[PDB]
Amino acid sequence: VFTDEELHKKYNSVELYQTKGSRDVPIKATRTIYSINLSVLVPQLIVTLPLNEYFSRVGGITSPDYKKIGGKVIVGDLEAT
Amino acid sequence: FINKRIVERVRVGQILAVLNRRFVAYKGKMRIMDITQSLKMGTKLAAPTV
Numbered sequence: 001v002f003t004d005e006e007l008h009k010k011y012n013s014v015e016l017y018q019t020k021g022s023r024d025v026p027i028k029a030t031r032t033i034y035s036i037n038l039s040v041l042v043p044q045l046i047v048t049l050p051l052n053e054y055f056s057r058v059g060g061i062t063s064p065d066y067k068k069i070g071g072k073v074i075v076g077d078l079e080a081t
Numbered sequence: 082f083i084n085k086r087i088v089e090r091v092r093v094g095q096i097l098a099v100l101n102r103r104f105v106a107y108k109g110k111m112r113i114m115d116i117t118q119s120l121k122m123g124t125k126l127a128a129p130t131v
Contacts, residue, residue, distance in 0.1 A: 065127055
């Protein structure tokens with residue numbers, strides 16, 4: 001997964017590349033889903049980690065003249081808790 | 082009978098006999114603007130929070 005040559009290799013080639021995916025939806029047309037190689041998603045894991053856990057809470061105060069930023073954005077879970 | 086000089090016949094020399102009102106006019110190169118609505122501009126200082 002993590003190798004100094006595997007992390008320096010590119011993907012803008014005909015030989016090696018990324019491969020898309022797709023999964024269905026209830027009434028809408030079939031939306032795509034992107035499959036990223038796990039070598040270059042771990043560098044996204046290390047720096048986006050205090051943003052996935054921070055907006056995971058459910059409570060928040062949404063005022064425009066409030067200085068904070070966490071209450072005004074919210075990302076829910078898969079199932080409605 | 083109405084005691085108001087509404088209509089009088091008059092000579093053509095006394096046409097300019099009604100010029101007795103002191104009018105006060107303003108210059109064309111100055112400006113006049115209404116700042117009545119300018120008494121409501123202003124932001125509210127919020128309190129510092131924790």
